[PDB]
From a paper:
Type IV pili are found in many Gram-negative bacteria as well as in some Gram-positive bacteria and archaea, where they function in numerous cellular processes including adhesion, DNA transfer and virulence. Furthermore, in the metal reducing bacteria Shewanella oneidensis and Geobacter sulfurreducens type IV pili have been implicated in extracellular electron transport (EET) pathways. PilBac1ΔN consists of one long N-terminal α-helix packed against 4 antiparallel β-strands resembling the core fold of type IV pilins. Interestingly, our PilBac1 crystal structure reveals two unusual features compared to other type IVa pilins: an unusual position of the disulfide bridge and a straight α-helical section, which usually exhibits a pronounced kink.
The potential nanowire type IV pilin PilBac1 from S. oneidensis was characterized by a combination of complementary structural methods and the atomic structure was determined at a resolution of 1.67 Å by X-ray crystallography. To obtain a soluble version of PilBac1, a construct was designed that lacks the N-terminal 35 residues including the signal peptide and the transmembrane α-helix. A high resolution data set was collected on another crystal and data were processed in the high symmetry space group I222 to a resolution of 1.67 Å using the CC1/2 value as a cut-off. The model obtained from S-SAD was then used as a search model in molecular replacement for this data set, and all residues were modelled into clear electron density with no apparent ambiguities. The crystal form had a large solvent content (62%) yielding a high optical resolution and favorable data-to-parameter ratio at 1.67 Å resolution. PilBac1ΔN was crystallized as a parallel dimer in the asymmetric unit in which the interface is formed by interactions between 15 and 20 residues in the α-helix from monomers A and B, respectively (forming a non-proper dimer with a screw-axis) (R.M.S.D. of 0.309 Å based on 79 out of a total of 89 Cαs). A: Sodium ion binding site in chain B. The Na+ ion is coordinated by the backbone oxygens of Leu36 and Phe44, as well as the side chain oxygen of Asn38 and three water molecules. Interestingly, this sodium ion was not observed in chain A due to a slight distortion of the ion binding site compared to chain B. The backbone of Leu36 is further away from the binding site increasing the distance from 2.6 to 3.7 Å. Interestingly, PilBac1 possesses a helix breaking proline at position 22, but a helix breaking residue is missing at position 42. Therefore, kink 2 is missing in PilBac1 and the α-helix in the structure of PilBac1ΔN is straight.
Author numbering: 1 to 89
């Protein structure tokens, strides 16, 4: 259901963040881009900071995904948004 799909999206943000840290560990910086796979339920994006020392990963629900947590995000510090009531990963 929609809750399961939210958690699926969260899991994908996490493995995406893990890949970004592997890049960071080799290069000392985050990459200019990251290929992400969208679904009928979420659109995923990667936004590095201008200095490439930070990033924001987001999962934006489509109209087909009527979930009360809305857009989910995860940054380079592990901060998960919404901060409460939403994340289980």
């Amino acid at each position: 259901g929609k809750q399961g799909r939210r958690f699926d999206a969260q899991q994908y943000l996490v493995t995406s963040a893990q890949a970004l840290e592997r890049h960071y560990s080799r290069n000392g910086l985050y990459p200019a881009s990251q290929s992400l796979a969208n679904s009928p339920y979420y659109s995923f994006s990667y936004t590095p900071t201008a200095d490439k020392f930070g990033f924001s990963l987001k999962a934006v629900p489509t109209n087909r995904q009527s979930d009360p947590c809305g857009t989910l995000s995860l940054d380079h510090k592990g901060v998960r948004v919404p901060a409460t009531n939403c994340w289980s990963h």
